[PDB]
């Protein structure tokens, strides 16, 4: 079996491996459409998560079931499914507590391109098929559906953690593919005014399409200064961090009104500590709640997000700015994701 | 001062009263646009709430501040404002608990056309101006803005009580002006599939416009039977009761899946007890939560709802099917609301 | 294998069956101490749940693991464990939603003496051992530990559903073994004043021991009248229904203040509908939330409840008023539970 | 009027001022018993909150009403009341949002010894009497009741923010008078195992009395190392920060399991930023919620806490290790609070 993998930190390349076999509750799937993400770049080049050797990358894909284990009773070979980036082991204490994202350990729900071979291979392994797979309605376009496994589930999760109330004003820091989904998410939770912080024009247009009522560009001056000005010193009800450096945390605390919420969905790869401004946090008593969590996964999560797209509540296709054809282009899409060209949001590779 | 009032149960008419004066924290407002409601029909003809004598009716209006008390520091004469139907006394224990709707007692937050003169008069009294008034942006049309005081706040409240999750399937029982707002509310909370139950064609079109994906008509058979069929025996995640008789409660419990929520915003005027099916409620342990509450009010509530309309998140104008001009037409709009013509949703009377 | 079972509705007796075998994830346990519940009386004599034939009864027990399946990695033969009355199948959509009590259907989490042979036999089957079993510390007495499987978990669940705030006044309707645990539960959630409603002296003393500050006896007059008097017309913040007829629902709604919660843990076996007073429910808008649900189960639930007993936070032994020795006494304890003698709370049978 | 005040940062002394007068909704109260707090030390010597001039200190006291404004309808002169340290203005947007602690601005609910003269004077001013005062039952001892205005409300608030579930294991970092209340608070929310971190023997005994099952002393080694050892690498479900330096934040994040909560009630006076460990916070996705807030206040809050003490749910007297008699001793108690003698927890000054 052939697959695009991480040879060692800093080095990527194509490798040769054996086709995986399914257990009684597992399934083997082949990619119909895949997509790269900033996560793999952080892990490969920055070595954010230790060091791996010959580990296939990628964690966003849709495809068809090739073979299933003897116990899989909801999926048969041939079926087209949406595979969540987070495929947890449903039989742990963490699941009983309510946190499947950390089933087995901190961030353990995230297996692909972490502690398991990713989707950038002729085939990939999915554990607990009946629990971690969802049927993809033939009415949904491949390029759009491939945005569900991660970009959508993460962005929407930011809006969910933000405790948005009807009419509340929300600020989204960072408008990359995830940030853009966070904007659409805020609108889906009832937000009134939505302020997006970014720079690249491509992201700006997408932001407006998704619901952004105001765009703040970090160039015309400091973020906190501009937002405070825009809200007449009142600040925002909630802030969603979808990108930026460690210092973006300070900015977030500085713009949320007392009693507001700061919801983070950004993966911080550098720094030792994230700074929380003492004064702006009311010396520890401003009632400004800080949250941050891995995106949900599983069958149910996917089924619900599929319903939103199906019933035309959201249209993720606007995120796909580049489409490639062929297994070989996986390498191209990956590299393109590294040296971020000013007109790129999210590239997709159609395999069949 | 002249005003339309309830003489005694069953008898309505125009009366003559003295113009009210404001206290240091109060304000006197004159109606720019008003609108009748079924609530007043229930109270006048059915005597649902005891008996009143020469009490001016109505609780839905927008207008301008005529005079304010010595302490009112946020509103001056001439200012155009949106008046909430619920104007509570903000200094009570209930407010400290978090329920301003019952500030001073059960349903005490509702003063107009209950324990205080309504809006159907040349002038009306508003208590705690800085706490119960909101500036109306000149960009919002009068007929649309008059939908914010009651219809919108109540409908949206049903969706809030329903604990809707992204992608969840919601059922709205009753599609009158309030039901239609409940539909729009569910869409704003992230609902996927929304089923609306009604009959009159006018409401049906409005329902679809607001987000209804399926329409169920109580004529083609029993509601519960149809919905269960439509959802393949799975049922709905949440149900919002926006109309119907006492028996509609039984229907609601029958269609929600275990662990679901039943949110009521309907004002039951007849019956002694509302029936909760023992078997369908899992003999008391199906985890089906039942809620029901008076719509929120106050300045903050109105300001947030205004933002939704201002930023084009919702367009309430589609509820107004009849517009009249002149103080004298208040009586006409009222009568029209009683003998519900098949083409009526919500009538509005523009005074100036 | 011998066991006490339900032959047909109305007829009980000892039967002969084959010893069950465990699947790869299951376990076979033998009873060390058991106890009967009111539940089995309702099912056998009243036929509350259809009709069964030769089904072994009982859903409360502690014992040792006889044999385990090939996959069970946390429990070995010889180990002493606490078996929850609710043993759900952890791989269902309901579990992903968060309601393991209805895993597979409404009330599906409850298998023993329902859709599976109970504990009143030389051996019984436990599904998903690593997920539904908890090690019993040798410091906890058998008679006390046998109160954890149902009574404690159910009573405490009533307090959890009640949304009790620090200092809130709670009313517990019905002080049987479950009601008494509800009293102890309220105290553990921070309740201040706790009013218990009952009659039998034995339960009264137990109630006081567990935290009841006031005792209301339905004989000195109507419940609602007495409680309202005691609270100076203010009512209670929350009410937990732990017993009574269908009409107890009406009483509950009548005594809770607007915005309060009504939490039910009582199993209603008779009646067609449970009445919800229209006027007292504020005509559908008093904000009085009504809840009712099957007690939690599983390993985590039991482990946490064990910690409470271990660290002397609760002492369930006071519920055990009768202890018997020997397998043959199971029949006696059962009959005693039917013709409720005035001095009985909960009988226990020690087998070894 | 005489009173103990802050002359300038670093300098304290007795001053002479005019007796304050009440507004129509205010009241003037004289101290019956008062107590010093760490807060005043931070403000006076460290200048944590700008610079004040001749501002009377303290904000923890019980006393009797001397005179009331014309509108005060619940309190008359002579009545003994408990005065909350937090006395907010109940008519602000923040109150409508639900955060009275920040009514008027960040930390604006805290007036005494901040932006208003404290309680260390012959008389002091209380705004909104009917909203910010509670009748003190004559059965409660003065020294115990003086612990309610702030020590109790803050400690309990830590347990409330921690989202404690029945049986959960909680860690309390810092066992000063506030930490000790947080311990008692955790027990009141249903905690099973409670680990307290401290050193001074006096605090240790009090900790055990209040519910601490394990005591960790920062001397036998690093906190995180010891706790992780004690929990067998599992960690704690929640952590309450009741004392320590800025680095205690890092420690808190390091000991809570993924999905747990970190509740802070400690007032950080030094440092620029509070460090949040990137790796231990799962790079921003460990689902570890961080909260921090000013203690609640108002009449309702006090009434409920009074009920807990009245019904013997808690006994705060154990916090009072030093009692003084006479207005002159206020200076002594204050100084004693500065140079913390190893046998001090909380000193009280009885005035009459
Ligand atoms: N583990 C998972 O499954 C998972 C899932 C979703 C997301 N994540 C993580 O969350 C982050 C999401 O990134 P993405 O995929 O949406 O793409 P991205 O292009 O990295 O998005 C970054 C966004 O924030 C920006 N930004 C950079 N510096 C900023 C600053 N100083 N202030 C404010 N904004 C700034 C960008 O602006 P311009 O581009 O306009 O310059 C852009 O809008 C990544 O770190 C990703 O690893 C992880
Ligand atoms: N106190 C307040 O401030 C307040 C605020 C909002 C609402 N409310 C109350 O809540 C209710 C809202 O009514 P509304 O103003 O929206 O107007 P409405 O016209 O009374 O709405 C009733 C809706 O439910 C219907 N319906 C009648 N029988 C039904 C049945 N048997 N099964 C299912 N649906 C049935 C109608 O169908 P067709 O019309 O299609 O026949 C209609 O769609 C009223 O009782 C009102 O008093 C009170
Ligand atoms: N499925 C499960 O796993 C499960 C678990 C727990 C509980 N449950 C159910 O919940 C209920 C719990 O009962 P229990 O085991 O605690 O024993 P119980 O003895 O049946 O408890 C009944 C309590 O309520 C009483 N009561 C009777 N009529 C009343 C009335 N009219 N008004 C107020 N109180 C009245 C009793 O008073 P006196 O005894 O003082 O007369 C007693 O205190 C049962 O129906 C049980 O089946 C089911
Ligand atoms: N604004 C308000 O109304 C308000 C209300 C309540 C509390 N607060 C604030 O919250 C804090 C509460 O302090 P307090 O009154 O309870 O008295 P405290 O004596 O300052 O309490 C400090 C506790 O944490 C300790 N500690 C010191 N260094 C530590 C370290 N490195 N690691 C772990 N623990 C350490 C102490 O241990 P030993 O004493 O055993 O050495 C003591 O147990 C204060 O900063 C106070 O200003 C403010
Ligand atoms: Zn990704
Ligand atoms: Zn109305
Ligand atoms: Zn039972
Ligand atoms: Zn203090």
PDB file of C-alpha atoms in Angstrom, chain B residues 172-339:
ATOM      1  CA  UNK B 172     -43.465  23.592  16.494  1.00  0.00           C
ATOM      2  CA  UNK B 173     -47.075  22.945  17.492  1.00  0.00           C
ATOM      3  CA  UNK B 174     -49.197  25.865  16.341  1.00  0.00           C
ATOM      4  CA  UNK B 175     -48.082  28.355  13.705  1.00  0.00           C
ATOM      5  CA  UNK B 176     -49.785  31.620  14.611  1.00  0.00           C
ATOM      6  CA  UNK B 177     -47.699  34.821  14.802  1.00  0.00           C
ATOM      7  CA  UNK B 178     -46.004  33.434  17.935  1.00  0.00           C
ATOM      8  CA  UNK B 179     -45.540  29.984  16.380  1.00  0.00           C
ATOM      9  CA  UNK B 180     -43.984  31.542  13.282  1.00  0.00           C
ATOM     10  CA  UNK B 181     -41.481  33.372  15.491  1.00  0.00           C
ATOM     11  CA  UNK B 182     -40.759  30.092  17.265  1.00  0.00           C
ATOM     12  CA  UNK B 183     -39.894  28.596  13.852  1.00  0.00           C
ATOM     13  CA  UNK B 184     -37.519  31.501  13.133  1.00  0.00           C
ATOM     14  CA  UNK B 185     -36.162  31.093  16.658  1.00  0.00           C
ATOM     15  CA  UNK B 186     -35.331  27.408  16.192  1.00  0.00           C
ATOM     16  CA  UNK B 187     -33.468  28.244  12.976  1.00  0.00           C
ATOM     17  CA  UNK B 188     -31.475  30.852  14.936  1.00  0.00           C
ATOM     18  CA  UNK B 189     -30.484  28.239  17.551  1.00  0.00           C
ATOM     19  CA  UNK B 190     -29.052  25.909  14.903  1.00  0.00           C
ATOM     20  CA  UNK B 191     -31.942  23.525  14.228  1.00  0.00           C
ATOM     21  CA  UNK B 192     -31.735  21.348  11.131  1.00  0.00           C
ATOM     22  CA  UNK B 193     -35.147  19.892  10.317  1.00  0.00           C
ATOM     23  CA  UNK B 194     -38.099  21.992  11.530  1.00  0.00           C
ATOM     24  CA  UNK B 195     -41.644  20.602  11.391  1.00  0.00           C
ATOM     25  CA  UNK B 196     -44.547  23.054  11.747  1.00  0.00           C
ATOM     26  CA  UNK B 197     -48.097  22.037  12.648  1.00  0.00           C
ATOM     27  CA  UNK B 198     -50.974  24.191  11.391  1.00  0.00           C
ATOM     28  CA  UNK B 199     -53.736  24.535   8.787  1.00  0.00           C
ATOM     29  CA  UNK B 200     -54.455  28.054   7.499  1.00  0.00           C
ATOM     30  CA  UNK B 201     -52.581  28.594   4.169  1.00  0.00           C
ATOM     31  CA  UNK B 202     -51.420  32.081   5.154  1.00  0.00           C
ATOM     32  CA  UNK B 203     -49.532  30.700   8.154  1.00  0.00           C
ATOM     33  CA  UNK B 204     -48.203  27.829   6.031  1.00  0.00           C
ATOM     34  CA  UNK B 205     -46.417  30.120   3.550  1.00  0.00           C
ATOM     35  CA  UNK B 206     -45.034  32.237   6.394  1.00  0.00           C
ATOM     36  CA  UNK B 207     -43.810  29.064   8.121  1.00  0.00           C
ATOM     37  CA  UNK B 208     -41.860  27.965   5.047  1.00  0.00           C
ATOM     38  CA  UNK B 209     -40.392  31.457   4.656  1.00  0.00           C
ATOM     39  CA  UNK B 210     -39.160  31.377   8.248  1.00  0.00           C
ATOM     40  CA  UNK B 211     -37.498  27.966   8.014  1.00  0.00           C
ATOM     41  CA  UNK B 212     -40.111  25.205   8.201  1.00  0.00           C
ATOM     42  CA  UNK B 213     -38.908  22.191   6.209  1.00  0.00           C
ATOM     43  CA  UNK B 214     -42.075  20.111   6.747  1.00  0.00           C
ATOM     44  CA  UNK B 215     -45.714  21.136   7.266  1.00  0.00           C
ATOM     45  CA  UNK B 216     -48.163  18.886   9.161  1.00  0.00           C
ATOM     46  CA  UNK B 217     -51.886  19.622   8.882  1.00  0.00           C
ATOM     47  CA  UNK B 218     -54.302  18.373  11.539  1.00  0.00           C
ATOM     48  CA  UNK B 219     -56.926  17.142   9.084  1.00  0.00           C
ATOM     49  CA  UNK B 220     -54.939  14.509   7.207  1.00  0.00           C
ATOM     50  CA  UNK B 221     -54.964  12.619  10.500  1.00  0.00           C
ATOM     51  CA  UNK B 222     -53.686  12.760  14.125  1.00  0.00           C
ATOM     52  CA  UNK B 223     -50.584  14.898  14.706  1.00  0.00           C
ATOM     53  CA  UNK B 224     -48.571  12.318  16.685  1.00  0.00           C
ATOM     54  CA  UNK B 225     -49.227   9.642  14.070  1.00  0.00           C
ATOM     55  CA  UNK B 226     -48.045  11.848  11.190  1.00  0.00           C
ATOM     56  CA  UNK B 227     -44.893  13.164  12.916  1.00  0.00           C
ATOM     57  CA  UNK B 228     -43.835   9.707  14.119  1.00  0.00           C
ATOM     58  CA  UNK B 229     -44.277   8.518  10.547  1.00  0.00           C
ATOM     59  CA  UNK B 230     -42.194  11.415   9.144  1.00  0.00           C
ATOM     60  CA  UNK B 231     -39.323  10.741  11.574  1.00  0.00           C
ATOM     61  CA  UNK B 232     -39.359   6.953  11.055  1.00  0.00           C
ATOM     62  CA  UNK B 233     -40.467   6.260  14.623  1.00  0.00           C
ATOM     63  CA  UNK B 234     -37.520   8.195  16.092  1.00  0.00           C
ATOM     64  CA  UNK B 235     -39.481  11.297  17.111  1.00  0.00           C
ATOM     65  CA  UNK B 236     -38.179  14.837  17.589  1.00  0.00           C
ATOM     66  CA  UNK B 237     -35.384  16.236  19.773  1.00  0.00           C
ATOM     67  CA  UNK B 238     -37.529  19.140  20.984  1.00  0.00           C
ATOM     68  CA  UNK B 239     -41.107  20.371  20.729  1.00  0.00           C
ATOM     69  CA  UNK B 240     -42.331  23.950  21.132  1.00  0.00           C
ATOM     70  CA  UNK B 241     -46.001  24.457  21.995  1.00  0.00           C
ATOM     71  CA  UNK B 242     -47.143  27.728  20.412  1.00  0.00           C
ATOM     72  CA  UNK B 243     -50.888  27.064  20.370  1.00  0.00           C
ATOM     73  CA  UNK B 244     -53.707  24.562  20.841  1.00  0.00           C
ATOM     74  CA  UNK B 245     -55.962  23.172  23.578  1.00  0.00           C
ATOM     75  CA  UNK B 246     -55.014  21.475  26.850  1.00  0.00           C
ATOM     76  CA  UNK B 247     -54.675  18.143  25.029  1.00  0.00           C
ATOM     77  CA  UNK B 248     -51.774  19.498  22.954  1.00  0.00           C
ATOM     78  CA  UNK B 249     -49.584  18.731  25.995  1.00  0.00           C
ATOM     79  CA  UNK B 250     -50.273  15.003  25.627  1.00  0.00           C
ATOM     80  CA  UNK B 251     -49.345  15.190  21.949  1.00  0.00           C
ATOM     81  CA  UNK B 252     -46.059  16.965  22.766  1.00  0.00           C
ATOM     82  CA  UNK B 253     -44.966  14.299  25.263  1.00  0.00           C
ATOM     83  CA  UNK B 254     -45.873  11.575  22.770  1.00  0.00           C
ATOM     84  CA  UNK B 255     -43.608  12.904  19.998  1.00  0.00           C
ATOM     85  CA  UNK B 256     -40.404  13.805  21.870  1.00  0.00           C
ATOM     86  CA  UNK B 257     -37.706  11.162  22.200  1.00  0.00           C
ATOM     87  CA  UNK B 258     -36.491  10.168  25.704  1.00  0.00           C
ATOM     88  CA  UNK B 259     -34.216  12.892  27.023  1.00  0.00           C
ATOM     89  CA  UNK B 260     -35.890  15.539  24.865  1.00  0.00           C
ATOM     90  CA  UNK B 261     -37.416  18.861  25.899  1.00  0.00           C
ATOM     91  CA  UNK B 262     -40.968  20.218  25.666  1.00  0.00           C
ATOM     92  CA  UNK B 263     -41.009  24.028  25.760  1.00  0.00           C
ATOM     93  CA  UNK B 264     -44.336  25.818  26.123  1.00  0.00           C
ATOM     94  CA  UNK B 265     -45.053  29.480  25.326  1.00  0.00           C
ATOM     95  CA  UNK B 266     -48.794  29.024  24.779  1.00  0.00           C
ATOM     96  CA  UNK B 267     -51.292  30.673  27.133  1.00  0.00           C
ATOM     97  CA  UNK B 268     -53.852  28.035  28.148  1.00  0.00           C
ATOM     98  CA  UNK B 269     -57.115  29.772  28.987  1.00  0.00           C
ATOM     99  CA  UNK B 270     -59.408  26.768  29.463  1.00  0.00           C
ATOM    100  CA  UNK B 271     -59.306  23.469  31.315  1.00  0.00           C
ATOM    101  CA  UNK B 272     -58.564  22.521  34.904  1.00  0.00           C
ATOM    102  CA  UNK B 273     -55.485  20.342  34.405  1.00  0.00           C
ATOM    103  CA  UNK B 274     -53.071  19.755  31.532  1.00  0.00           C
ATOM    104  CA  UNK B 275     -52.648  15.998  30.893  1.00  0.00           C
ATOM    105  CA  UNK B 276     -49.195  14.368  30.934  1.00  0.00           C
ATOM    106  CA  UNK B 277     -49.452  10.804  29.480  1.00  0.00           C
ATOM    107  CA  UNK B 278     -48.167   8.374  32.113  1.00  0.00           C
ATOM    108  CA  UNK B 279     -46.956   5.697  29.676  1.00  0.00           C
ATOM    109  CA  UNK B 280     -45.422   8.150  27.170  1.00  0.00           C
ATOM    110  CA  UNK B 281     -43.690   9.997  30.006  1.00  0.00           C
ATOM    111  CA  UNK B 282     -42.028   6.665  30.822  1.00  0.00           C
ATOM    112  CA  UNK B 283     -44.096   6.346  34.002  1.00  0.00           C
ATOM    113  CA  UNK B 284     -42.276   9.419  35.301  1.00  0.00           C
ATOM    114  CA  UNK B 285     -38.766   8.470  34.182  1.00  0.00           C
ATOM    115  CA  UNK B 286     -38.362   9.053  30.427  1.00  0.00           C
ATOM    116  CA  UNK B 287     -36.193  12.130  31.071  1.00  0.00           C
ATOM    117  CA  UNK B 288     -38.542  14.318  29.019  1.00  0.00           C
ATOM    118  CA  UNK B 289     -38.248  17.793  30.546  1.00  0.00           C
ATOM    119  CA  UNK B 290     -41.346  20.009  30.458  1.00  0.00           C
ATOM    120  CA  UNK B 291     -40.970  23.811  30.545  1.00  0.00           C
ATOM    121  CA  UNK B 292     -43.286  26.786  30.117  1.00  0.00           C
ATOM    122  CA  UNK B 293     -42.675  30.457  30.733  1.00  0.00           C
ATOM    123  CA  UNK B 294     -43.629  34.097  30.266  1.00  0.00           C
ATOM    124  CA  UNK B 295     -41.541  35.889  27.642  1.00  0.00           C
ATOM    125  CA  UNK B 296     -38.567  38.002  28.759  1.00  0.00           C
ATOM    126  CA  UNK B 297     -38.755  41.790  28.768  1.00  0.00           C
ATOM    127  CA  UNK B 298     -36.754  44.820  29.796  1.00  0.00           C
ATOM    128  CA  UNK B 299     -34.252  47.004  27.963  1.00  0.00           C
ATOM    129  CA  UNK B 300     -31.514  44.406  27.349  1.00  0.00           C
ATOM    130  CA  UNK B 301     -33.958  41.925  25.824  1.00  0.00           C
ATOM    131  CA  UNK B 302     -35.295  44.533  23.378  1.00  0.00           C
ATOM    132  CA  UNK B 303     -31.831  45.874  22.470  1.00  0.00           C
ATOM    133  CA  UNK B 304     -30.616  42.391  21.499  1.00  0.00           C
ATOM    134  CA  UNK B 305     -33.744  41.610  19.471  1.00  0.00           C
ATOM    135  CA  UNK B 306     -33.335  44.983  17.719  1.00  0.00           C
ATOM    136  CA  UNK B 307     -29.784  44.005  16.734  1.00  0.00           C
ATOM    137  CA  UNK B 308     -31.103  40.809  15.130  1.00  0.00           C
ATOM    138  CA  UNK B 309     -33.545  42.802  12.969  1.00  0.00           C
ATOM    139  CA  UNK B 310     -30.990  45.550  12.277  1.00  0.00           C
ATOM    140  CA  UNK B 311     -28.313  43.107  11.086  1.00  0.00           C
ATOM    141  CA  UNK B 312     -30.877  41.329   8.910  1.00  0.00           C
ATOM    142  CA  UNK B 313     -30.856  38.104  10.933  1.00  0.00           C
ATOM    143  CA  UNK B 314     -34.685  38.160  11.059  1.00  0.00           C
ATOM    144  CA  UNK B 315     -37.436  39.999   9.165  1.00  0.00           C
ATOM    145  CA  UNK B 316     -40.692  40.190  11.189  1.00  0.00           C
ATOM    146  CA  UNK B 317     -42.596  42.253   8.596  1.00  0.00           C
ATOM    147  CA  UNK B 318     -43.986  39.078   6.993  1.00  0.00           C
ATOM    148  CA  UNK B 319     -46.261  38.692  10.023  1.00  0.00           C
ATOM    149  CA  UNK B 320     -48.128  41.925   9.276  1.00  0.00           C
ATOM    150  CA  UNK B 321     -50.943  41.071   6.854  1.00  0.00           C
ATOM    151  CA  UNK B 322     -53.132  44.092   7.635  1.00  0.00           C
ATOM    152  CA  UNK B 323     -52.186  47.736   8.247  1.00  0.00           C
ATOM    153  CA  UNK B 324     -54.661  50.449   9.294  1.00  0.00           C
ATOM    154  CA  UNK B 325     -54.247  54.198   9.804  1.00  0.00           C
ATOM    155  CA  UNK B 326     -55.794  56.190  12.645  1.00  0.00           C
ATOM    156  CA  UNK B 327     -56.664  55.953  16.332  1.00  0.00           C
ATOM    157  CA  UNK B 328     -60.261  54.930  15.502  1.00  0.00           C
ATOM    158  CA  UNK B 329     -59.117  51.777  13.702  1.00  0.00           C
ATOM    159  CA  UNK B 330     -57.860  50.280  16.979  1.00  0.00           C
ATOM    160  CA  UNK B 331     -61.398  49.017  17.538  1.00  0.00           C
ATOM    161  CA  UNK B 332     -61.515  47.528  14.035  1.00  0.00           C
ATOM    162  CA  UNK B 333     -58.169  45.742  14.386  1.00  0.00           C
ATOM    163  CA  UNK B 334     -59.343  44.395  17.733  1.00  0.00           C
ATOM    164  CA  UNK B 335     -62.608  42.994  16.366  1.00  0.00           C
ATOM    165  CA  UNK B 336     -60.763  41.509  13.379  1.00  0.00           C
ATOM    166  CA  UNK B 337     -58.532  39.683  15.856  1.00  0.00           C
ATOM    167  CA  UNK B 338     -61.624  38.183  17.514  1.00  0.00           C
ATOM    168  CA  UNK B 339     -63.427  36.756  14.467  1.00  0.00           C
TER     169      UNK B 339
END
